Design an enzyme around this catalytic site. Structure first.
Site: not given
Ligand SMILES: Nc1ncnc2c1ncn2[C@@H]1O[C@H](COP(=O)(O)OP(=O)(O)NP(=O)(O)O)[C@@H](O)[C@H]1O
Lengths: 107, 67, 49, 204, 49, 218, 49, 49
Positions: F100, F181
């Site tokens: 985050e 990712d």
């Protein structure tokens, strides 16, 4: 792009750690609190030896094959001339490049 | 050779230095309780050579507080 | 999406999977009927499940 | 307007309709080609330039960091033209020039009486493993050399381009006579010379 | 624990309706029990009864 | 009669009438709220405001604050709450929080160098629904999302990579977070080179081949 | 739909992978001949039977 | 390790029962040290034989 991100991140380590320490406790954060937390710790003004070593560690070794001298027919493939006959346009490019760099010694 | 500093130190410096060294060692190593050496030397790639300010363990330690 | 309107069904409760202690308690009651060697470290046999 | 083998413009708008989410430029339908099918080779090269002109101008005015996703379908159309030149036996490869297409043609009936759809099959039995590389390399040369050419064209005629875009911004729709007038009074002299040389010919 | 501190109020309703039917909270009309194959939610229900 | 789905203003006015009775804190911007909920129809906002109301009454207050409205929205878009992350070890919470925080940090940094990225809104590591952690952005007007320039796509790629690279730079060691990712990133990168033609492949960016999507009707 | 894995046609004909066909074939041939030879050598001393 | 067995149910293999901790990597995390350790452990048997 990955080198850009890794360069951004290996400067604001203190800001990232302050953010982690803050978030792990309340389990929620709003944008304003985050913005001020990240503003509290700016990046270093100068590069010390530890910072320079970290920035050198922020590099990648992703191999890029057709980079530089490898932009011509073999394209850095060692075995390409044992598998493919040489195309026609490649021969033409070799010819024009050879005449260019072989009349420039006279030019 | 080895460390020189002063000559042979007195008797009060010995005691106050023993307690001070104990305090600093404890407060320095406080946040790295219960993990292996490879995890540590990959968390602190630049060396464990100053106090940590962001500890997030189950019983978290604050800045410069001892155990 | 018709029943999820207010008054009809406005509350949902999530019942999660047990943990070590929960499983230990579960199997300590499935033993009240059957025959079982008493001194069983229920916590450890529950950690492996 | 500056390419002597393309039809003259008839009107240019910037008002999106309910189906086309960008502007349109419309050309006068040349009846000869449309009825006989005599689309020459010169014309196909110039149509390639026209298909790339949009992106060329966007990059010229708004800078390279502002290339948009408005030229996806014009890029597909330029690819179509470039592959049709190769598959219609117009290439410059000696083993391909006036001799062959790319593969084997098979036609199929469309959703109408006279409409046929073409298909080309290329296998190891007609392409020799190092003519594939030449097909790629030459289509690529066509596309990117055409882009460079049209970019330099628009570079030489910046004044007319900005004049046209200002007028289009202020009127929201223009016709062909205004375009030709503006460009003839503001264009580069050499491009106007070429455009005047081929002015009378019916088909090119 | 979370849904314990939550279902205290549905038990409050089930004990005496006019206690909170006018106290501001809405009418508890319907609830859903979500979990996973093998959660045996019936169990929980019985406790509330 | 043809009634279409509401636009930004339609949802805004449904919200207005739905809280006309209630009271809200003066800090929340409900234009910005209705701007971040494209796709809901009429009753969903009612469910959101009622859920926020009952979280208010459980909070021992009556004024609806940003936290309660966000809780309502999260419950009616993500799903029911779930038990928190364990704390017996450093790893789980550390890794998810690092994800985050890295995303938020590089987002706020890119926004302050070119100005294309949006602003971060709310970071959370409360397991809720199917995910364990979340990072929400502030959506712009629809005028923003009709085009896709080059810089905007570059920034999207960087934001895709940020999470895994942050976890690796904090933990000091590679994980499987990178796995999630690169996948996304690679997809976008292909679209950057073939379909849109932004790269320098050939001298200009025009390649001989490209893969245009197909409609979701198929 | 052409073939794209050309690797060698200078002193042999190879395509990408295959590395594992010479080893396989020489093993198979060697073992079959050894077995046939042992059979022959045994039956060669028992012709009267 | 919880239990090590040889030819269970007469299958021609071994079997080792590993118990792990679900509060360390909560069904989602996989570092690099773990992966390298697993590779070594899976090749150990071949090497010992
Ligand atoms: N807390 C508990 N204590 C004791 N037994 C339990 C508990 N939770 C579940 N069980 C057991 O779980 C078993 C399966 O229950 P079941 O009624 O099948 O739940 P279920 O989730 O509705 N089944 P399914 O419809 O497939 O999802 C029961 O026979 C119980 O013995």
């Amino acid at each position: 792009c990955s080198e850009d991100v890794l360069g951004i991140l290996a400067e604001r380590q203190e800001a990232m750690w302050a953010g982690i320490k803050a978030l792990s406790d309340r389990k929620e954060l709003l944008g304003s609190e985050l913005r001020d937390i990240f503003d509290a710790h700016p990046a270093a003004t100068s590069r010390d030896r530890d910072a320079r070593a970290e920035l050198a560690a922020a590099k990648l070794d992703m191999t890029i094959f057709t980079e530089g001298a490898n932009s011509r027919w073999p394209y850095g493939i060692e075995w390409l001339d044992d598998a493919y006959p040489k195309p026609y346009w490649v021969q033409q490019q070799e010819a024009e490049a050879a005449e260019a760099q072989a009349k420039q010694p006279a030019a | 050779p080895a460390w020189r500093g002063p000559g042979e130190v007195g008797d009060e410096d010995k005691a106050v230095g023993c307690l001070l060294g104990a305090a600093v060692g404890n407060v320095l190593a406080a946040p790295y309780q219960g993990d292996r050496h490879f995890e540590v030397i990959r968390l602190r790639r630049n060396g464990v050579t100053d106090f940590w300010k962001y500890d997030i363990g189950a019983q978290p330690v604050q800045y410069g507080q001892y155990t | 999406s018709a029943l999820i309107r207010p008054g009809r069904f406005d509350r949902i409760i999530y019942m999660p999977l047990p943990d070590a202690l929960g499983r230990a308690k579960i199997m300590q009651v499935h033993a009240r009927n059957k025959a079982v060697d008493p001194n069983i470290n229920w916590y450890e046999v529950a950690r492996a499940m | 307007t500056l390419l002597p083998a393309i039809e003259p413009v008839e009107y240019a708008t910037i008002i999106p309709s309910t189906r086309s989410p960008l502007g349109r430029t419309v050309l006068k339908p040349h009846v000869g080609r449309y009825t006989t099918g005599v689309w020459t080779y010169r014309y196909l090269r110039e149509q390639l330039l026209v298909a790339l002109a949009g992106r060329a101008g966007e990059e010229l005015v708004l800078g390279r960091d502002e290339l948009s996703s408005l030229n996806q379908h014009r890029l597909q159309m330029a690819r179509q033209v470039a592959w049709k030149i190769m598959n219609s036996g117009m290439s410059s490869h000696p083993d391909y020039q006036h001799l062959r297409g790319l593969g084997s043609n098979y036609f199929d009936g469309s959703s109408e009486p006279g409409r046929f759809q073409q298909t080309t099959v290329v296998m190891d039995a007609n392409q020799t493993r190092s003519e594939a590389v030449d097909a790629d390399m030459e289509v690529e040369g066509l596309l990117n050399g055409g882009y460079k050419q049209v970019f330099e064209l628009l570079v030489r005629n910046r004044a007319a381009l900005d004049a046209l875009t200002e007028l289009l911004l202020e009127r929201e729709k223009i016709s062909g006579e205004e375009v030709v007038q503006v460009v003839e009074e503001l264009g580069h002299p050499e491009d106007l010379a070429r455009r005047a040389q081929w002015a009378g010919y019916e088909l090119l | 624990d979370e849904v314990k501190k939550e279902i205290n109020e549905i038990i409050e309703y089930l004990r005496n309706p006019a206690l909170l039917r006018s106290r501001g909270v809405a009418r508890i009309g319907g609830v859903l029990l979500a979990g996973a194959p093998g959660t045996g939610k019936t169990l929980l229900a019985k406790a509330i009864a | 009669i043809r009634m279409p789905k509401p636009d930004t203003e339609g949802r805004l006015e449904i919200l207005k009438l739905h809280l006309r009775n209630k009271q809200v804190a003066p800090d929340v911007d409900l234009l910005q709220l209705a701007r971040d909920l494209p796709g809901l129809v009429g009753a969903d906002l009612a469910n959101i405001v009622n859920e926020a109301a009952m979280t208010a009454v459980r909070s021992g207050r009556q004024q609806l604050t940003a936290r309660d409205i966000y809780a309502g929205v999260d419950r009616f878009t993500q799903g029911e709450v779930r038990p928190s992350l364990p704390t017996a070890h450093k790893l789980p919470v550390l890794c998810f929080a690092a994800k985050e925080i890295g995303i938020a940090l590089v987002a706020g940094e890119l926004r302050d160098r070119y100005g294309r990225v949006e602003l971060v809104e709310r970071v959370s590591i409360q397991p809720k629904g199917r995910a364990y952690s979340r990072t929400m952005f502030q959506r712009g007007t629809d005028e923003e999302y009709q085009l896709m320039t080059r810089g905007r796509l570059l920034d999207r790629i960087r934001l895709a990579l940020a999470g895994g690279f942050a976890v690796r730079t904090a933990l000091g060691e590679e994980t499987n977070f990178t796995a999630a990712d690169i996948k996304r990133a690679t997809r976008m990168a292909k679209k950057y080179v073939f379909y849109y033609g932004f790269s320098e492949a050939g001298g200009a960016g025009i390649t001989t081949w490209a893969n245009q999507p197909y409609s979701g009707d198929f | 739909p052409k073939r794209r894995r050309w690797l060698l046609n200078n002193g042999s004909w190879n395509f990408w992978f295959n590395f594992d066909k010479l080893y396989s074939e020489e093993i198979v041939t060697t073992w079959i001949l050894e077995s046939l030879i042992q059979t022959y050598k045994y039956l060669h001393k028992n012709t009267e039977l | 390790i919880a239990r090590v067995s040889v030819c269970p149910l007469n299958v021609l293999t071994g079997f080792t029962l590993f118990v792990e901790d679900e509060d360390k990597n909560v069904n989602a995390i996989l570092t690099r040290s773990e992966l390298e350790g697993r590779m070594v452990v899976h090749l150990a048997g071949r090497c010992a034989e």
